[PDB]
Design a protein around this ligand. Structure first.
Ligand SMILES: COc1cc(=O)n(C)c2c(OC[C@@H](O)C(C)(C)O)cccc12
Ligand SMILES: COc1cc(=O)n(C)c2c(OC[C@@H](O)C(C)(C)O)cccc12
Ligand code: PRO
Ligand code: PRO
Ligand SMILES: [Cl-]
Ligand SMILES: [Cl-]
Ligand SMILES: [Cl-]
Ligand SMILES: [Zn+2]
Ligand SMILES: [Zn+2]
Lengths: 344, 348
């Protein structure tokens, strides 16, 4: 009997038991949903490392055709897959108090209004009572909640190895900000996978995300002023001494003035010349805006805004998570040590 | 390029986690330093063994054979254990201040009655270099600690009851915290690591098996202090447990902190696990997990895999408890490896 996950009752223990059994060779897992099943071949993601306040977070992938990824920490697990182009997440926290808190947090925006189609956008999942997970379709949720259109308008400021190079992405929880591990990890996973999908870049780089708290807080709602202050705080921080050549993000749950989702120094990271904390940006981590860190990481690696409305780098926020621009893909890969003669 | 280092005069959980979390597929050089001590170790992730303790993921790390160094890393704790001049030294660091304080008090308590003059070489609370008030880790030299403490002689006398693949076979080692028992994650994981490494060191057995340890609580408690009666009841509790249905072919340990009557450290069903015939929860045993008796789970796992008591006093399978963690008996090594699918023609 093939291993399975029942999406009508999926808990943290269910996801952890299955994902912890994934060996080097991968594992078939059936996702079961109202009598319809999806067989996914799950593998450990060996390219990316993540710590959130030193808590280890592991990533898992399906095959490209499976359009499925997982996240696993000691405290939470995530299953994220697509249906009719929409992003559906199952988020399960291990501790009952935290699972109850998370369920209330995600349910609260929907309680203000009373949608007739609320369950397809948001649903508390119970064991076959307190919730064991939540199901959120962020595309459907954004249509019900009628959120202000947060975009990427002026979200940037201008200024073959045998072993991939490790590049740390040092994320710093802004002073006074509260972020949720499932949300931060999802941004990190989408950011890393947007890079590996380009020109076989896992041969050149392995991204290592870490999360700490910083004393820095943006002095205003302005993203440009905030990024200026953030990069200045890194240069003056004794804790960052010796790491001026890594990538940095100031993260928060919310957004900046003019519904700016994030901002970064354009074309500020190159594997040979990285220095002076230039490769820095800021990003929201809220669930309803997947791919913001990926978009900002794209700018740091040199990607400009793209003309295809399905591109991660489109000037408007779309929810698409991959680079489609060949010009951007070449710029990003060249900044990470790739050359055309190396192929994909 | 400055080699990474661990300062054993101030080593904390954060120190060990940041170093071990930086270990890639290719390994990492780390210098262990202390007053009058240095060791350059090439650290690698242990990809053979998986561990969850109540679903908390625990990762193992190895040095080269000549480094005599291993590490354990969980979200809540980290361990560095190395051998120096024939003695086993562990640095145990818990992330949370409350738990680190509790752990430091727990390890210090046996020494507070026997106030030895040479206490620091056996046990020491380690503090941070800039502040320290509360300990960031504890150093325990088990061999020196056993000479200071008047511990009763705990042994293995009658601790056994006589009842190449391309991908290694996964074998779960399902450990169950006995009802009413309190165990510490650094202690349980050290027993698991030593047990797994005693198997892989024999006939290149990582080609045949990858051990996956899990820890849960059981409602079972031994009805008395008798290890034989305890093991009988434990194997019976597995056969009657609905949670274990479908897993009768895995390996099981009932674990506790303490020992059984007659200072018995553990017990197991001899020659009860074979990769082709494993069934009926036969591959089961019991093991202490206390820090001062490293290798008990390894010794009991040896018996489950068919190893008999060996005559070399340096063998893991010697009938007396020694603290040695490897099989030396060629007869035992062949029995264990054959029970895991190995054949002489396969080589090492
Ligand atoms: C507020 O900034 C930081 C806060 C903080 O706590 N730390 C530790 C920082 C930091 O350390 C990462 C470092 O240990 C590596 C990359 C080796 O894993 C580097 C840069 C910044 C910080
Ligand atoms: C008290 O015994 C048990 C308690 C308990 O909670 N569980 C889950 C047990 C169990 O499951 C292991 C299982 O999830 C696998 C091997 C897939 O990882 C097997 C055998 C026993 C137990
Ligand atoms: O995953 C589990 O088993 C529990 C159920 C609710 C909260 N977490
Ligand atoms: O459903 C849709 O159209 C959007 C586009 C990308 C993510 N989902
Ligand atoms: Cl929300
Ligand atoms: Cl800071
Ligand atoms: Cl039970
Ligand atoms: Zn942009
Ligand atoms: Zn024995």
């Amino acid at each position: 009997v093939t291993a399975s996950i029942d999406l009508q009752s999926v808990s943290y223990t269910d996801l952890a038991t299955q994902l912890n059994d994934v060996s080097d060779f991968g594992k078939m897992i059936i996702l079961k949903d109202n009598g319809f099943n999806r067989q996914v071949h799950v593998s450990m993601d060996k390219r990316t490392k993540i710590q959130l306040d030193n808590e280890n977070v592991r990533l898992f992938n399906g095959r490209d055709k499976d359009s499925t990824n997982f996240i696993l920490g000691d405290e939470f697990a995530v299953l994220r897959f697509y249906r009719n182009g929409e992003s559906i997440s199952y988020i399960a926290y291990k501790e009952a108090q935290m699972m109850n808190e998370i369920a209330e947090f995600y349910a609260a925006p929907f309680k203000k209004t009373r949608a007739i189609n609320e369950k397809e956008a948001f649903e508390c999942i119970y064991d076959s009572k307190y919730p064991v997970s939540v199901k959120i379709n962020v595309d459907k949720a954004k249509k019900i909640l009628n959120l202000p259109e947060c975009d990427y308008i002026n979200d940037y400021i201008k200024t073959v190895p045998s072993e991939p190079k490790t590049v740390y992405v040092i994320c710093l929880r802004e002073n006074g900000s509260t972020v949720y591990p499932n949300e931060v990890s999802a941004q990190m996973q989408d950011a890393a996978n947007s890079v590996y999908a380009v020109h076989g870049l896992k041969r050149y780089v392995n991204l290592h995300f870490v999360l700490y708290t910083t004393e820095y807080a943006c002095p205003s709602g302005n993203a440009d002023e905030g990024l200026d202050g953030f990069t200045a705080s890194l240069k003056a921080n004794p804790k960052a001494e010796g790491y001026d050549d890594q990538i940095y993000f100031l993260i928060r749950w919310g957004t900046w003035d003019n519904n700016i989702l994030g901002i970064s120094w354009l074309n500020s990271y190159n594997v040979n010349t990285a220095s002076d904390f230039k490769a820095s940006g800021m990003s929201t981590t809220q669930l309803m805006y997947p791919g913001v860190m990926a978009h900002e990481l794209g700018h740091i690696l040199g990607a400009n805004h793209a003309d295809d409305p399905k591109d991660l780098m489109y000037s408007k926020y779309t929810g698409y998570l991959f680079h489609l621009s060949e010009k951007n893909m070449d710029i990003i890969a060249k900044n990470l040590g790739w050359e055309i003669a190396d192929g994909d």
